[model samples]
Target: KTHVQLSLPVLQVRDVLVRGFGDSVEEVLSEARQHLKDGTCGLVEVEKGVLPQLEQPYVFIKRSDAAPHGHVMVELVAELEGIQYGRSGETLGVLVPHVGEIPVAYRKVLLRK
Candidate 1:
């Protein structure tokens, strides 16, 4: 089965007609990082932005789905900054942005090597 998660704690809010899922029991956290609130509380970080407080209940909402899996969502109430990619250059050897953009090695074989 697909894993589900809720990065935020279950606050007192009216229930809506939607599916509830979580990857882990601890997925429901006290801090609710938006963007992954679309029913799923996946691990996600957002871009740089400032969010303004609302006069009402002060509920934040993210509407744009343009962001990738590792992107943040900030709407009109918040400032949205584009994610910066690529390093720039390298050392004695020629290193390009793409070459330096590789993800960290997390495999056991790579660790052993």
Candidate 2:
């Protein structure tokens, strides 16, 4: 287990790129949705070779069970900004920490419809 700051917003990762420890898409997507809606942010526990790059990038949140005093990784993914299209519509671009900003449409919620 390691501790690191997420230099990117969790929302930037498209739903397609987000994976879960479940078998169904709904389960995985639901997990991601909950995490994003809660404004969750942390170190990514996944591998760089797993998902293809998105508008900004992907982050693997640290497992909740990880010890805070554990080793740390240099990888950084930061969330700079966020905009909700409408009250109930979807989320748009997120400001990235490293490169500055990137415009991205929230396709996960849309795809569920």
Candidate 3:
């Protein structure tokens, strides 16, 4: 098994993102509700392709063991500014470290939707 450690600043960034999603739950609830009604299987693809272009940091949170199937997870990327981040599956991890001022920026982007 692999274990990764993060600094306080990085964790803070994660907290902001998580809280931001909570704050903006209304924005995506409609879609989530439909998924529940159908009772099928799918992934909660949030800000999927957007983060790479904007140079923001993010994390991937899986809701349960059957997640993606469980219909919940947060997958994010934290890349250095001006340095092109990887779009590969490896970079878009379940949990990752990030740089400064990314959480608020991400929240703004999500809220606009």
Candidate 4:
């Protein structure tokens, strides 16, 4: 089965999608970092930009057709940001973003990972 994941439940982006889908679930879990809400969660540390808020927040949405692992639907609403690739220097990192207050859908689970 296909594995689906939205870094930011309500968010979407083109950069991360490219890289996220190419890797396996285990790979994603280890390879990908978490970009969270309030900038207090995840592996990626976000810095404040122009207004004490993240500059161009990340709305990372990722999924795969067959990841050789488990698949779950985690949807959330957050911001989107375009960041340069750091690891391979070609693929954009799709981090997880979470909107705690608005547990939008799919069981209303606000996943930040």
State the lDDT of candidate 4 residue by residue for 1-113, as single tens digits: 22223233332222112212123343333333333333322212233331123223332332211122233333222232333222221111234333242323221122324
Clashes of 3: 5
Tens-place lDDT per residue, model 3, 34-91, is 3223432122224555344321333333222122222222223323333323232322
Per-residue lDDT value at 74 in model 4: 37
For candidate 4, give the lDDT. Answer: 0.29
Candidate 2 TM-score versus the reference: 0.24
TM-score computed on alpha carbons, candidate 1: 0.18
C-alpha root-mean-square deviation, each candidate: 18.3, 14.9, 15.8, 12.1
Give the Cα lDDT of each candidate: 0.20, 0.28, 0.26, 0.29
lDDT of 4 at 69: 25
Runs in model 1 lying further than 4 Å from the true structure:
1-6, 14-57, 70-72, 76-113
- Candidate 1 vs 4: which has more TM-score: 4
Candidates in descending lDDT order: 4, 2, 3, 1
lDDT of 2 by residue, 1-113 (tens): 23332223323333333233233334433444444434342112233543334322222222222122232222212221242121221122222222222323211111111
Q: Estimate each model's TM-score.
A: 0.18, 0.24, 0.20, 0.24
What local lDDT does model 4 show for residue 103?
24
lDDT of 1 by residue, 3-22 (tens): 22222222211221121222
Model 1 steric clash pairs: 4-22, 4-23, 5-22, 5-23, 5-41, 9-29, 46-72
